[PDB]
Design a protein around this ligand. Structure first.
Ligand SMILES: CN(O)C(=O)C[C@@H](CP(=O)(O)O)c1ccccc1
Ligand SMILES: CN(O)C(=O)C[C@@H](CP(=O)(O)O)c1ccccc1
Ligand SMILES: [Cl-]
Ligand SMILES: [Mn+2]
Ligand SMILES: [Mn+2]
Lengths: 410, 410
């Protein structure tokens, strides 16, 4: 039995996790959902509790906690431990009946839970890549202290890369640890991208694309923020840095490749030059599922890949002139220090402005470029708590700087 | 330092093995070529001996044995053990100073060295699919007895499949052992094929193809016999049965896919429906190398795959009407018993007839089909040597039968 907690259980990743768990458990009873944690959606948590009957329930919003207790009374033969706020989150993390925790919470709250999962030596199925991009240093330090803690990637390209590895080697190291590449004989990564909706556009057409254009025909079902990032290819830029940190691959050895059919999810080139790749329909259930079964696999009733029907797969290089966010990402990542934090934070702002029709496509990369240019390297704290504060402070500064640039721009 | 013997060193597999060995050794000293064995090409063996200076030399044909000595006399500072025939082959296989044996003698003669390599508990890097097809059950029996022997596949599609597997699972089983696919969580195999030169021919055009046509512009550089089998897709038919025996995959779960770019070498679908595939340019050096380094990989300086340049990859189902040898292979595999032995033997004859312009394209399948039709199942001998004799008997019968059908037809 695999004992799993889901943090952010009503979000996109959390609901998809519960769905694949539900379907796999119908084939063979494999998963015990031990804990559910949601922010404010008390009715939804009740509905999930009702079905999965976890040992622990936690609602963050303290205002709705009594309500939740009332609701859950109505579930027969069920007496969970019902908690609330950060304190309930920490109690769940410390439970020895939980082996794996899905982090389906974004933003800072997600980093805080991640930290507690790591501090409790858990397997952390991490779907918030922004924490890896912005706080990579902090997570690396934390994983060095907590030896048995492991981050398993859920972002599809990174899951794919992870799935292309030999677990006989993987088990001698772990993600976000120096030497992961050496131990796994990794030479190079092909990081695949859908390319978004603008691949064939000229620079003059790109100048006038709108967020309505950007949210059209996404190849995956996803939130607005990531969909804008897909259109600018900043999503892939961020994913380049995620790759560097998870797998200890040099920036030079990470190649972004536009694969519009979204069947090959990424590929790993090993030192002999043999390449291995992972393929499936664009469906988040596979990467989520693997993060819960690794190092095993279990039976599903997902539709099998029909290669003959797919028929054709295509690959081309992205143009850095048309997708300058990609260049900025490499530049920030290579510079290192806290430039990735700055890149991520300034993009948060620039992305939202474009989403809301306040700036134009090349304004996004312009703003980000300017914030990056304004930032001066800071000495990296050795102290873990000081380091975390540095990251938050720089993140906050970068958001304000991005906003100030927008505000001062006519 | 890996100690290697090459059986059939002057064939396409052998020369490719020496080349990748030579190149890897220029990076770092990794392989010792301990032994070279050829059927009768003295001048070529002598050139190989001059460069690699192996401890052992073996020429099967004794009529050219003294000639070999006379040639090797010339090489200075070099006093190798110069053996001949089956006896020298046996002496090489049982030497302690040999860890891995590359079998690149495809002729059913290669069965013998395969056997002796297994009997001496070696790692057998096997590129003689005919022995697996004809004697699979026998080899399985032998591997059950010799617990430390391992067959590592060299045939490119089977190396690909093997490379897509998690060695943390592989090491709990071995090729040609019951339950290999269960232990490795294998649901299905996409067995890729170049398709040969005749994929786009109509039925009428196919009726007329000659061996000249078939040997034209092939996607891989190999011997005539396999190049003809590639044209008829009987090579893929044999490889279906090879897949069944190596990995214990049901015939129902093996799908042949025509992939004309020859970049994806085959794919594995796991029980969760995730697919993993192995890719490289069409170059036998990678699968050979992996068989010699498994469970590890080592650095090469081979050209890195450039996916963007390759640009497009395509997949389609083969037409069984155009390629009836595929259907015959499945039918023989599904029936089991000694039908694969008969399939392989009859094809040896039919292939050579076509190669030599004695029969037509559809005469190949017709002959094979008729020989299969004329065979009745036999009691499988439980004694291992009785079983070998049975296999040689039936193989020899099937060749005679196929020759008779040809001789009697106008
Ligand atoms: C699934 N996954 O891991 C993603 O990163 C989804 C991205 C893919 P990309 O950045 O366009 O390559 C995406 C595509 C389309 C719309 C929104 C996001
Ligand atoms: C490399 N390898 O493992 C082979 O089986 C070579 C075959 C490939 P196929 O049977 O055409 O798919 C082949 C293709 C073209 C010419 C000769 C052989
Ligand atoms: Cl999302
Ligand atoms: Mn992604
Ligand atoms: Mn092959």
């Amino acid at each position: 039995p695999i004992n799993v907690a889901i943090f952010g259980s009503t979000g996109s990743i959390g609901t998809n996790a519960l769905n694949i768990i539900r379907e796999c458990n119908k084939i063979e009873n494999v998963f015990n959902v031990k804990a559910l944690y949601v922010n404010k959606s008390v009715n939804e948590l009740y509905e999930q509790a009702r079905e999965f009957l976890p040992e622990y329930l936690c609602i963050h919003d303290k205002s709705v906690y009594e309500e939740l207790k009332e609701l859950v009374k109505n579930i027969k033969d069920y007496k969970p431990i019902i908690l609330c706020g950060d304190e309930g989150m920490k109690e769940i993390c410390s439970s020895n009946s939980i082996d794996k925790i899905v982090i389906g919470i974004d933003s800072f709250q997600g980093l805080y839970s991640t930290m507690y999962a790591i501090m409790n030596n858990k397997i952390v199925a991490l779907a918030n890549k922004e924490s890896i991009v912005s706080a990579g240093f902090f997570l690396k330090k934390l994983l060095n202290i907590h030896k048995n803690a492991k981050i398993i990637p859920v972002d599809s390209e990174h899951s794919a890369i992870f799935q292309c590895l030999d677990n006989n080697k993987v088990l001698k190291t772990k993600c976000l640890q120096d030497n992961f590449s050496k131990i796994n004989n990794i030479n190079k990564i092909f990081l695949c991208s859908s390319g978004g909706p603008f691949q064939n556009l000229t620079m003059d057409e790109l100048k006038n694309v709108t967020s309505e254009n950007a949210l059209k025909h996404p190849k995956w079902k996803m939130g607005k923020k990531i969909t804008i990032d897909s259109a600018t290819m900043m999503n892939k830029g961020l994913e380049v840095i995620e790759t560097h940190f998870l797998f200890d691959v040099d920036y030079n050895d990470i190649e972004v490749i536009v694969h519009k059919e979204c069947i090959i999810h990424s590929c790993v080139e090993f030192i002999d030059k043999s390449v291995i790749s992972q393929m499936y329909y664009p469906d988040m259930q596979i990467p989520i599922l693997y993060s819960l079964t690794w190092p095993d696999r279990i039976k599903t009733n997902l539709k099998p890949l029909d290669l003959a029907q797919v028929s054709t797969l295509t690959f081309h290089k992205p143009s850095l002139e048309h997708f300058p966010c990609i260049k900025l990402a490499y530049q920030a990542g290579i510079k290192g220090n806290f430039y990735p934090t700055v890149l991520n934070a300034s993009n948060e702002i620039a992305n939202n402005l474009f989403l809301n029709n306040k700036i134009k496509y090349f304004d996004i990369s312009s703003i980000i470029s300017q914030v990056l240019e304004s930032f001066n390297s800071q000495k990296v704290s050795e102290n873990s708590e000081d380091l975390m504060k540095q990251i938050l402070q720089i993140h906050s500064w970068a958001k304000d700087k991005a906003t100030d640039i927008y505000n001062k721009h006519n």
